[PDB]
C-alpha cells in the first residue's frame, strides 16, 4: 500500500527526503528543481530549469506507475514572477488538457539557488 | 476517476491550470486570488481581496458539489503578515467550526500583484 | 472526519484547527517552534526546528499515528542558510524511509518564527 519511490532517472534528494511516496493510488512527489540527474547540476536559466523540472517529475511519475496525466495538483515556487509567462508556456508544452489544479507564488530563495521548484500530487 | 471542475462564478485561470480537480470525495482547488470573476481585476486592498478569495473558493466548492464546510486544509500566502489579524477575521466571518487545518506564510510576491492567495483541499 | 486537538501541541494562533483526519489521511497545520506550555517560540532556528518536530509528533499521536506515517512535509524557512541544520534536524528526528518534501525560503512567518513545517500523514 505504501511505497517510497526512488529512481536514478530523476535527481537524488539534496536534503533529508525521498523522491516520492505512493499510498494507494495517490502519489506525493517532492519539490523538484531543474537538476540534470546525470550531473546533479542545475540547467542554465529559468526556461531550461523549468523544462528539466518537468522531465524530473515525469520520471518520478513513471516510477510511481503513472504519468504526468495523473497529476491532480502542482505547487509552483518561483524566485521571479517575471518568469510566469514562460512558466505557463512550459506547462502547455508538457501537459495536455484538462490541466491539473495549481498554485504559484514568488519565494525569496530556493534550495541550491534554483529559480523554480514544483511539487506534485497524483491520483493514478 | 478525476473530474475537472469549472465554473463561470469563479475567475478564469490566469495560467496553465484548471480551477479544481476532484478525485472521489477529495477536491484540490487551485490557488485563488482576489479577482472579480467577471472583470478579472483585483479588488482594492487586502480585506476586499480576502473576502473575494473566499467568494471565489465558495463558488468552486459549490461547482464540485460541496461547500466551505468541506474544506479540510487551507494554504494561505500573504505579501504582508501585517494583514494576519484581518485574515483571521475574514476566516471567522466566512467559516463555521470546526475550522480547517491551515498554513500561512509571507511570500515575496503573488501573480498579478495580488496580496493574498489561498489554496484549498476539500473532503466532501 | 475528525478535528484533532491536543494541548501537547501548540494552540492555534489563528482561525484554524491543529489537524483534520479524513479516512486514512491527516492534514496537519503548519507548526512553528512554540513551547506548548508557554506558547513562546524557542530561541533560534535549531531549537525552533526541534520543537516543531515535537509539536508535529504530538499531533501525529493524537491522530492515531506517528512520524513514521508522514508522507509529505512542506518546509518554509526564513533563511536558506538554515538548510544544512534543517537537514540535520530531520535526520535526528526521522527514520528511513523519509517522507517526500518541499522546501523554500519565504519572506516571513507568523509571530516571527524562522521555520514552519506542514505535514500530511497516511495512517
Amino acid at each position: 500500500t505504501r511505497q517510497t519511490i526512488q529512481t536514478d532517472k530523476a535527481p537524488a534528494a539534496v536534503g533529508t527526503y525521498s523522491q516520492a511516496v505512493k499510498v494507494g493510488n495517490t502519489v506525493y512527489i517532492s519539490g523538484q528543481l531543474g537538476f540534470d540527474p546525470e550531473t546533479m547540476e542545475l540547467r542554465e536559466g529559468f526556461k531550461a530549469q523549468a523544462e528539466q523540472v518537468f522531465e524530473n517529475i515525469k520520471a518520478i511519475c513513471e516510477a510511481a506507475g503513472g504519468s504526468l496525466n495523473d497529476v491532480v495538483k502542482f505547487n509552483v515556487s518561483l524566485t521571479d514572477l517575471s518568469d510566469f509567462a514562460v512558466l505557463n508556456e512550459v506547462f502547455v508544452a508538457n501537459l495536455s488538457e484538462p490541466y491539473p489544479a495549481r498554485a504559484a507564488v514568488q519565494v525569496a530563495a530556493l534550495p541550491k539557488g534554483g529559480v523554480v521548484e514544483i511539487e506534485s500530487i497524483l491520483y493514478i
Side-chain angles (χ1 to χ4, degrees), chain A:
Chain A
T1 293
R2 177 177 173 145
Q3 292 175 317
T4 300
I5 306 302
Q6 169 58 40
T7 175
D8 292 0
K9 294 183 176 176
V14 293
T16 312
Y17 59 95
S18 298
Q19 285 173 346
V21 179
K22 179 177 188 182
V23 281
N25 290 312
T26 300
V27 186
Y28 298 89
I29 300 182
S30 291
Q32 289 304 302
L33 304 160
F35 294 113
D36 176 1
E38 301 241 28
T39 66
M40 291 299 301
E41 296 168 8
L42 291 168
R43 302 290 186 190
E44 294 302 319
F46 174 84
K47 190 177 184 190
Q49 283 181 36
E51 292 174 341
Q52 184 68 56
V53 166
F54 268 97
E55 291 306 302
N56 294 341
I57 292 172
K58 181 185 297 224
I60 295 163
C61 286
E62 291 182 358
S67 76
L68 288 171
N69 200 230
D70 298 312
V71 177
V72 297
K73 168 79 184 301
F74 283 121
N75 224 315
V76 180
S77 300
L78 301 185
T79 49
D80 185 353
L81 271 161
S82 304
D83 296 318
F84 193 66
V86 175
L87 177 79
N88 285 324
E89 294 182 74
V90 171
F91 268 59
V92 169
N94 284 275
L95 300 165
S96 48
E97 297 187 281
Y99 298 124
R102 197 177 79 177
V105 304
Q106 188 181 311
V107 299
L110 292 171
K112 306 297 191 178
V115 298
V116 54
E117 181 179 339
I118 300 180
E119 304 156 61
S120 316
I121 297 169
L122 286 57
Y123 184 84
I124 297 174

